Write a protein that binds this ligand. Structure first.
Ligand SMILES: Nc1nc2c(ncn2[C@@H]2O[C@H](COP(=O)(O)OP(=O)(O)OP(=O)(O)O)[C@@H](O)[C@H]2O)c(=O)[nH]1
Ligand SMILES: Nc1nc2c(ncn2[C@@H]2O[C@H](COP(=O)(O)OP(=O)(O)OP(=O)(O)O)[C@@H](O)[C@H]2O)c(=O)[nH]1
Ligand SMILES: Nc1nc2c(ncn2[C@@H]2O[C@H](COP(=O)(O)OP(=O)(O)O)[C@@H](O)[C@H]2O)c(=O)[nH]1
Ligand SMILES: Nc1nc2c(ncn2[C@@H]2O[C@H](COP(=O)(O)OP(=O)(O)O)[C@@H](O)[C@H]2O)c(=O)[nH]1
Ligand SMILES: [Mg+2]
Lengths: 32, 427, 426, 426, 409
């Protein structure tokens, strides 16, 4: 059960990081 | 010959709503834009019988612009002229000068360019703004900066509304007035002051209106502009142009601040019982009970004065009347200037608009003078601006927008230097 | 174009917001069904600020209801104008905090606030140009104070460049509904001074006083209190919805009334508010609105400003009025009582006029004053907080959830230096 | 002109197809007795794609029911739109496989597949320009999966140029009805990767989850789930049946979404889907349709696409709409969420617009994303398959029927090499 | 004198469905059109909308050609597999259309290169027309895919493979994007939510303005052979930016004062080009100005002078006389339900420059990226192609880029 919690925490962190990355990419496109 | 008129801010385009109202009612054009050649200075002709004004209304808040889009004159104004932003500067000079101004003034410029290109003998521009706000102050000064670098030699008649000494609606307006004058100083060629308490007192005493709104204020301002452009629109016995005021009234390239007045502002009943002639209106144009800026020229000294005359006026008595003024001793002129007057007479009387509270007068005088009493108002502004600046009140909003403490001190000492300049020319 | 998304939290927030949406929808001529039935074209021009057209005249309010117990959600859908809210905007927990700020800010908030954030995101991106957010809540309860304050902090770090109004009633000893009121108020105010752009202080004590003397009501239920609060909220944002001779938007009010970033607690009043027995004997002019506005017994807080000094003040007028009269009345009340005003700021009053009165009256006004007397509440609340915390009363319900002792000491220090810093500028 | 022959297999195929022919017959305005009774002219000129005029205005569907148990045939014939099929097309065995893939693929199929092929051939050459075949079956059952899969292989041997659609449901461990689900699904996919043209993957978790969350149904029987699947199938072949501003046939969608020949497993979604209580609280615009389309919680598979990247995507729109809004919405989602899309392919979204909405609606949409998140299920299946096959559970029920150990190893091999190629292209 | 028009594909015949509506509404002057047309497509859905539409009796039944099944956004399918059975029937009709004619100026073709029918059998039709007639002009008004606004996925493959034949088959090729036209309808026509119908209406305006010189007598007439000389300085550089003025609504038109000077200016700003490219990066090789309606030669003469003396835009060092004017008397007509107001005078400008060299370079990366990993290539190869023609079409556009850079210097 412990490893299951690790899975559902790492994906959520991974998801937040991917969303931040998209924001940065969008800003570069507008600024260029 | 053509002159285009730009309006910035809530007070600016409201003033325009009264001016173009007065204009079409004077030249016999319905609000839809068709007649049932002197209109060429202000209206361009489509060629299909439709006349369109040479003007651009622009501001940062869409409320005041869109009642205009749906009033009676929906069809008079070309749609592109009525520029409108999306959010307001909110009584914040920096916000109108650097944050939000930088996106909107470039659209206004590439508009105003094709207004000038449609013109042939452009006499100049004339701008309307109130310095108490953020739009009229911030992007107004920014617009004047870019106008000076574009044209330079063309006149820019600034009819500005300064904040009243005691009657005020905003609280950060001392900051806005000082920073705005810092650039209005070296850009506007001829800048006319229009206070608000003075116009309030005129409507209370002269027009005997005890409950005036902004409508009557804007109405009489349009009357002064109409009296000032009649010389350009119509032929008279002795006319002047807009390039005449550049030379004849400002002795030094930094002393350009004029006190305006108009006569006779008379209700519908006094005119029936009272007499109109040139001598008494020449008198009434000088008394401080009829000035548009709360200052007293009795405390100052005149450099040069200007006199617009409208209606059935011959030239012999305007000379005799101005002679009587010089022989009086209540007002005195500067030692360096033996002759201090610039007179002008035009044939067409001032027309009346239905719904206004101005009577149909046979003759009228519009006086535009330059003095040193204007130095007292600027000093009066410095006391209460410096009052709050030392403790750094309200500074955090402007500096949070992207400004610093440097521009307050450097703008402060520039207008402080102007105080010393006014005192040394008066001596 | 300029847009306000509305957020209601807790039981206090839900009743306040319920009577609020009835008042605005009735102003814009929208019936309980939610279809347009008004007459004037002017009412349609400015419905983008609070509503979205769905289909066939159906206008839905741009609001989000957020709570923890379903009694409030069902009480909202039952009453009139209850069928206008989108049912998806009823983001909602199930367990209940129950007057425990730690339960409202650490345990139940941590799983509900992601949901309420997602609804707010959709509501914010659904529109184009945000003017600000509008949050109504209380400071005594748990599901309004702790959760709502966490929502404020989360939103402020998301959209930092937009305004934000929060209308909060605060507890007082004379109206003491719960027992841990100070432990909730002190921690909530600590977060409000560092997150919210401006707050509008309210209280239930002053509202009861208004309903006794001015309204002269027999049975002032909560419906009438929410009626007064709703009239204030409609009055302040009337400028964005209707044109006038001198328009003053929310940001224009914020920069004109806040001299320093920490001094953003206002006391509010509204006029005219008269009983039906004396409403017949009255006149409607500018001086009668002012001398009922600036009366101390009309403020909606129990903080008498003459026990302090006015920094700035503001009046939002509605109805066809003469601007000369507006300005001379503000001049008169500032020149006579010059001692009650701050000295190093002349012309302490910002004024504005709008040309649309509320229905049922010919002329109205709305007063927003930023005085320094608001510190009476901070000292008045902090001593009760100290009286329990010196002796560790009720502490374990806060401690056993994740909070430690330095949170209370930091909260005490920030509230204490805040009342100290109000006193210095005083 | 272009022709679609329909083939249904097994219990799942028959009941899905029953609801399908209900909604298509209503769209073309055909009564349950077989005669035309529609109103618009548009509904007549394109019924040959699905029907055959027999005599006296009798339009019979071009369908083939196929199973091994008579319960499904009698339930089909009993209900409405049951007396519109030709009784000769009810090709039907008698013994029954019963969740044994070997029975449905080697023993019992061997005596039925001859009769189905006779009927489908006579029914194929009856029309002039065949567009393709359309199969609806399952991958957990025996007579649906095994016989339907064998029929797919034989058909692709005879007609190798014609198109082929397969709406197949796959088993998931959260909704696990039979015990031998992995043994069937793994072998079934082994044949689907080499025989079908494209497969639109379905599942019951997402369907039950959709009716819970978005539709908010109380008792979602198979009727509602089959109703949703049918709405997808009508949306995918609306371009042939109705004129539009931009047409996209079956082949057109296949070439724009399949970048490599073995990468032909899709995810499907249908919009708009709203609860009955909130149907009037919403607009009907293209942006609203797009927000519901690209929601990861709206696919009809239990595979979150945000767990991987989209290779391509497709959006079929129906209704009077502006093409500019279509392209701007697709471009907007392509720029803001840049990480979820493949980089060495710009324009991962093909779009199309038809001018006739489904009956009862104003504007609808169908999404077909070919993502690389689909590989999780193949791993999610292969781990179960190895769990049984490491230890020969249930293996003899298939071994004593013809399958040897190399067949299961081959199925594992094909499953493993497939999940590596999805991982490669992510 | 007559000129016949061919329309290919979903985009081609929808453009024609608006273009012919304008021709009938506009009308011995008719002799050049009355129709001398052919619609042809592989999908029968859009052609048979015409067969049942309002213009049932207007078109002779045979004219409307229609295949059996679509090429499905597949250049190879619409050029090798399915084209081979329908193209012969089409061109063996167009021949007898030309035999009906006596003074054929040329053909004009309408196609979009993104699709398979517009691109594939477009080029196939062009190749048999070039070997059959050779000398007669074939004006091709094509629709290239936009850089950022896009509806398909494999359209880079189609656009490159179509261009390789559009070079040496058509005589005068006018680019038209969809984003640029969308921007035009958004900016000038203030239509915030446009569809394909509005685009096709103003495309017809451009076509009508360049054939009105044949139809009606003007002060300075210009035939199709005139564009052949005056705008293409090299046999392989014929790709024209288009523009039109005044594109204006019904209310704004009355308010503004349309004249010759300002519309000559407005037809030169990049805010009014029909192709998404910035000619500020390029240098004008030649310009062509069709004036319709109320035009005296003086103000058009004065207007080209002001353009030459401006420095916001530059010309090549080769052409001091870099213009070709043309004046026709009849004003442009309006369509009920159309959005363009009636104007006394309008200007359709067709230029040639090096800004077009940017669109090909922009196109190259998108095609290059997909081709390197061999995306979607298996569809085209199984259709009948090979890796040879992909790589060789690639190097043809590479040569064209160097060509524009060399001539622009
Ligand atoms: N004379 C005169 N002054 C006006 C009128 N309307 C507004 N004002 C003045 O304008 C000042 C404030 O500026 P506004 O024009 O109202 O607002 P703004 O300049 O656009 O600045 P923002 O509020 O930030 O948009 C006030 O102090 C008024 O004195 C008017 O009708 N007549
Ligand atoms: N201007 C304009 N362009 C269109 C129109 N219809 C389609 N297009 C363009 O055509 C391109 C795709 O080709 P289509 O014409 O739709 O289809 P096709 O050329 O016949 O090829 P197939 O789909 O295989 O039949 C798209 O990129 C669109 O931009 C239209 O009505 N007006
Ligand atoms: N004005 C007003 N105040 C209310 C109303 N209902 C509750 N309150 C106030 O809410 C406070 C208690 O907060 P509570 O409702 O428990 O907040 P919550 O539990 O966080 O939602 C009391 O001091 C009340 O004065 C109402 O209808 N109107
Ligand atoms: N959506 C849907 N799924 C079904 C239906 N009937 C069966 N299933 C699914 O099919 C699987 C069993 O397939 P089965 O009916 O035994 O196939 P067959 O025996 O080969 O005909 C189960 O996982 C069910 O979830 C139905 O009517 N609708
Ligand atoms: Mg096509």
């Amino acid at each position: 059960e412990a490893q299951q919690n690790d899975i559902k925490a790492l994906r959520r962190e991974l998801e937040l990081k991917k969303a931040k990355l998209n924001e940065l990419h969008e800003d570069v496109r507008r600024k260029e | 010959r053509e002159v285009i008129s730009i309006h910035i801010g809530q007070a600016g385009i409201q003033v325009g709503n009264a001016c173009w109202e007065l204009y079409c009612l004077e030249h016999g054009i319905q609000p839809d834009g068709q007649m049932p050649d002197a209109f060429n200075t202000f209206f361009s002709e489509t060629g299909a019988g439709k006349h369109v004004p040479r003007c651009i209304f622009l501001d940062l808040e869409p409320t005041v612009v869109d009642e205009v889009r749906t009033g009676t004159y929906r069809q008079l104004f070309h749609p592109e002229q009525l520029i409108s932003g999306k959010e307001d500067a909110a009584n914040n000079f920096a916000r109108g000068h650097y944050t939000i101004g930088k996106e909107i003034v470039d659209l206004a410029l590439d508009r105003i360019r094709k207004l000038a290109d449609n013109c042939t003998g452009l006499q100049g521009f004339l701008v309307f703004n109130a310095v108490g706000g953020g739009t009229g102050s911030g992007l107004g000064s920014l617009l004047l900066e870019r106008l000076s670098v574009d044209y330079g030699k063309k006149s820019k008649l600034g009819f500005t509304v300064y904040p009243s000494p005691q009657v005020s609606t905003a609280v950060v307006e001392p900051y806005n007035s000082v920073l705005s004058t810092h650039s209005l100083l070296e850009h506007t060629d001829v800048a006319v002051m229009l206070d608000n308490e003075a116009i309030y007192d005129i409507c209370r005493r002269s027009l005997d209106i005890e409950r005036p709104t902004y409508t009557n204020l804007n109405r009489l301002i349009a009357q002064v502009i109409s009296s000032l452009t009649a010389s350009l629109r119509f032929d008279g016995a002795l006319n002047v142009d807009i390039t005449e005021f550049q030379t004849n009234l400002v002795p030094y390239p930094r002393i350009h601040f004029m006190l305006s007045s108009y006569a006779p502002i008379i209700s519908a009943e006094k005119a029936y019982h009272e007499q109109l002639s040139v001598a008494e209106i020449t008198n009434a144009a000088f008394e401080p009970a009829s000035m548009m800026v709360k200052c007293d020229p009795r405390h100052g000294k005149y450099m040069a004065c200007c006199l617009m005359y409208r209606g059935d006026v011959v030239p012999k008595d305007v000379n005799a009347s101005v002679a009587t003024i010089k022989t009086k001793r209540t007002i005195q002129f500067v030692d360096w200037c033996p002759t201090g007057f610039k007179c002008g007479i035009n044939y067409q009387p001032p027309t009346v608009v239905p719904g206004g509270d101005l009577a149909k007068v046979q003759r009228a005088v519009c006086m535009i003078s330059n003095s040193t009493a204007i130095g007292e108002i600027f000093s009066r502004l410095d006391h209460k601006f410096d009052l709050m600046y030392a403790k750094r009140a309200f500074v955090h909003w402007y500096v949070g927008e992207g400004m610093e403490e440097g521009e307050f001190s450097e703008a402060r000492e520039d207008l402080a230097a102007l105080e010393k300049d006014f005192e040394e020319v008066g001596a | 174009m300029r847009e306000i998304v509305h957020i209601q939290g807790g039981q206090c927030g839900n009743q306040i917001g319920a009577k609020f949406w009835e008042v605005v929808s009735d102003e814009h001529g929208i019936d309980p069904t939610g279809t347009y039935h008004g007459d004037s074209d002017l009412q349609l021009e400015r419905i983008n600020v609070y509503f979205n057209e769905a289909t066939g005249g159906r206008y839905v309010p741009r609001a989000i209801l957020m709570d923890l117990e379903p009694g409030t959600m069902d009480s909202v859908r039952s009453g009139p104008y209850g069928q206008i809210f989108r049912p998806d905007n009823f983001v909602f927990g199930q367990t209940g905090a129950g007057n425990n700020w730690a339960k409202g800010h650490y345990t139940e908030g941590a799983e509900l606030i992601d949901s309420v954030l997602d609804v707010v995101r959709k509501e914010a991106e659904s529109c184009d140009c945000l003017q600000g957010f509008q949050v109504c809540h209380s400071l005594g309860g748990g599901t309004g104070s702790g959760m709502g304050t966490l929502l404020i902090s989360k939103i402020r770090e998301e959209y930092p460049d937009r305004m934000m109004l929060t209308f909060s009633v605060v507890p007082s000893p004379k109206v003491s509904d719960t027992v841990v009121e100070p432990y909730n108020a002190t921690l909530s105010v600590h977060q409000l001074v560092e997150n919210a752009d401006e707050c509008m202080v309210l209280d239930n004590e002053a509202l009861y006083d208004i309903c006794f003397r001015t309204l002269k009501l027999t049975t002032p239920t909560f419906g009438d209190l929410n009626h007064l609060i709703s009239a204030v909220m409609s009055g302040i944002t009337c400028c964005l919805r209707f044109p006038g001779q001198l328009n003053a938007d929310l940001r224009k009010l914020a920069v004109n009334l806040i001299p320093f970033p920490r001094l953003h607690f206002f006391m509010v009043g509204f006029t005219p508010l008269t009983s039906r027995g004396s409403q017949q004997y009255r006149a409607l002019t500018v001086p009668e609105l002012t001398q009922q506005m600036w009366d101390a017994k009309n403020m909606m807080c129990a903080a008498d400003p003459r026990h302090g000094r006015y920094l700035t003040a503001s009046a939002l007028f509605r109805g066809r009025m003469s601007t000369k009269e507006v300005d001379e009345q503000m001049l008169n009340v500032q020149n006579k009582n010059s001692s009650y005003f701050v000295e190093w700021i002349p012309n302490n009053v910002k004024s504005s006029v709008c040309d649309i009165p509320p229905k049922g009256l010919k002329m109205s006004a709305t007063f927003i004053g930023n005085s320094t007397a608001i510190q009476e509440m901070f000292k008045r609340v902090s001593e009760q907080f100290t009286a329990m915390f010196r002796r560790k009363a009720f502490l374990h319900w806060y401690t056993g959830e994740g909070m430690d002792e330095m949170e209370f000491t930091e909260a005490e220090s920030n509230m204490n230096d805040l009342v100290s810093e109000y006193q210095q500028y005083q």
